[PDB]
Ligand SMILES: Nc1nc2c(ncn2[C@@H]2O[C@H](COP(=O)(O)OP(=O)(O)O)[C@@H](O)[C@H]2O)c(=O)[nH]1
């Protein structure tokens with residue numbers, strides 16, 4: 001019936017692949033993680049609506065700045081990711097990802113996703129960041145970035161525990177089925 | 182917000198990087214493909230063959246064959262009904278290298294002077310024999326007796342590397358009805 005293409009972008013190591021593998025296989029990798037997940041389509045139901053969600057992972061490296069955009073054409077919704085325990089990936093959304101996604105696709109909806117939510121409360125993770133004079137991204141900080149890039153929705157999830165993970169893909173779909181002209 | 186074109190890289194450099202990474206090899210096969218390096222010698226890298234105006238309410242087709250006589254197009258008039266919804270369909274072929282950020286630019290004139298500028302990003306595409314197609318989101322034509330009239334357009338296809346792939350002229354007339 002309906003076809004929705006979703007592309008996931010963001011810094012390397014933010015959890016793009018694990019997010020897709022965890023969601024599609026229903027299990028977190030935690031062993032061998034390929035640099036990029038292969039393209040798969042999820043047959044989902046969203047209130048009596050038959051949706052075929054095509055998922056696309058991306059190589060975040062600067063070396064592929066020229067190749068990565070080849071997957072952007074015909075994209076219905078983008079998931080721009082940043083790790084909730086990585087302020088650098090958060091600022092990279094401001095300096096790189098949002099400008100890149102908007103340059104190639106000016107009208108396509110964006111969903112800002114905060115990854116690794118399970119680590120925001122992790123004592124060891126928090127202490128390591130504090131050593132470098134850094135702190136995790138709080139909900140208000142993430143929501144503030146979402147407003148700055150005019151995203152359609154701000155969501156936080158964990159591919160490891162799966163908290164809020166399914167919600168991310170349901171919202172990607174609602175961003176297309178219930179837009180704003 | 183800012184944005185700047187990434188450094189240039191040949192297809193060779195892209196294929197030779199991380200040559201042992203199994204997932205990146207598949208990634209490249211999905212985006213660039215594998216097998217015979219097919220090219221059409223004696224043809225620029227981009228070649229835009231035709232620009233069509235998808236208008237559901239319009240009687241006959243309103244398209245422009247870009248491989249034909251450009252001088253007749255420069256002198257011809259395409260009629261667009263005021264306030265009607267439409268989408269532009271582009272047909273083009275990427276030949277040898279990757280095209281980064283191919284885009285359409287248009288300079289609109291009326292009474293001999295420039296009154297409007299408009300563009301739309303087509304995207305980045307890899308070289309292949311088969312042509313690509315592209316449709317922009319639905320748009321609505323101008324409405325009102327102030328907007329109704331004949332306009333002279335200067336169009337061109339460029340990219341992130343500022344390479345002119347095509348330039349031509351045509352006329353547009355916005356009227357109360359298709360006639
Ligand atoms: N605690 C935790 N680690 C995660 C989560 N997601 C990915 N990771 C880890 O973060 C690193 C990067 O994961 P990956 O998905 O390959 O990153 P990508 O470069 O953005 O694709 C790996 O060590 C993962 O195990 C998560 O939700 N929670």
Ligand SMILES: [Mg+2]
Pocket residue numbers: 013016017018034035036037058
């Ligand atoms: Mg990855």
